[PDB]
């Protein structure tokens, strides 16, 4: 039930969670600030870019089972946010893992829109 909720919503975990929201944008910024780096170097940058995109999917998976799935429906500040996490996770899992995609798109802006949508998270955490 809500036994794990006593552990997760602890204020020592949420500071770490938002710390990760900042860390992700740090690493992703050092990534695009170093165009043309080592091949193994563009591996752990994308390593974290996926690792920190799976953490926010597990965190959003725990804020439904131990928080109530009906608290999100009438909450527009949690629908758009979960939608952003899903979109980011899908586009990241494509860009990193699933390179089977070799169909035309004219270089899709989704690799950009997701980098942009990772700012909106920080935007909404300065509004709460």
């Amino acid at each position, epitope marked *: 039930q809500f036994r794990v909720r006593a552990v997760i919503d602890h204020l020592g975990m949420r500071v770490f969670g938002v710390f990760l929201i900042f860390l992700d944008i740090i690493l992703m910024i050092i990534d695009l600030s170093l165009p043309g780096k080592s091949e193994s170097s563009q591996s752990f940058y994308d390593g974290m870019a996926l690792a920190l995109s799976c953490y926010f999917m597990l965190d959003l998976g725990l804020r439904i089972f131990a928080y109530g799935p009906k608290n999100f429906f009438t909450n527009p500040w949690e629908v758009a946010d979960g939608l952003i996490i899903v979109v980011t996770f899908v586009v990241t899992i494509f860009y990193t893992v699933l390179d*089977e995609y*070799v169909q035309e798109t004219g270089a899709d802006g989704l690799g950009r829109l997701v980098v942009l949508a990772r700012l909106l998270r920080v935007v909404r955490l300065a509004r709460i």
Partner: antibody
Amino acid sequence: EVQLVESGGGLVQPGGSLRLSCAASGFNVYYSSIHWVRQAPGKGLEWVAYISPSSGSTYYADSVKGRFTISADTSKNTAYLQMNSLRAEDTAVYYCARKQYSYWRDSYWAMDYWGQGTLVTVSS
Amino acid sequence: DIQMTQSPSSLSASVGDRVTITCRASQSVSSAVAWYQQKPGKAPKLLIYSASSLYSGVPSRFSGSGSGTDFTLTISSLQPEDFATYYCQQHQYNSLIFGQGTKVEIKR
């Protein structure tokens, strides 16, 4: 324990057709990717066809586009290459080779295991 | 359309020399380049993948070095059984392009 045994090559009248069979052993084709690369007598290597029954996408070279049709049967674990409207220039030795999928950003995979190579001669 | 210029066309070298075949790309194409060896009549066999990573079974003398757009197959100690032709290739499907080919001959 991984082998690509191919067959089907031979003499064939120009304009006529002929199919090459690349049988796989020791892996599931459904997950990897099979190419056809031919070589004209006393010439370089030329990539021809591609298939992956995973995604289902297929690509062809310009010199064979519209004439060649690379299929695959995961039932018998074998990739097929149908060569239609054969020209004299197609006279070459055909190899089939496997290349498994890379899921990183280095693409640290190449065509490790090749076929035996079968001779396709197009003449009258 | 990526131009793979493999230089030199052919080379002759004595046993145990340091052979260095170079494969230049028309543009920036990462570092996903292969090196194959083909003995006459046989099927091409993989030596190097990703331009520097050695394949299993391949001798120690075969090394891969990538610099700029120029990739380099290097044989430290040439052997009489290294008589073959050598090709450079690319990875990521539907974009794989072979090189011109280098014919290696043993001087003796």
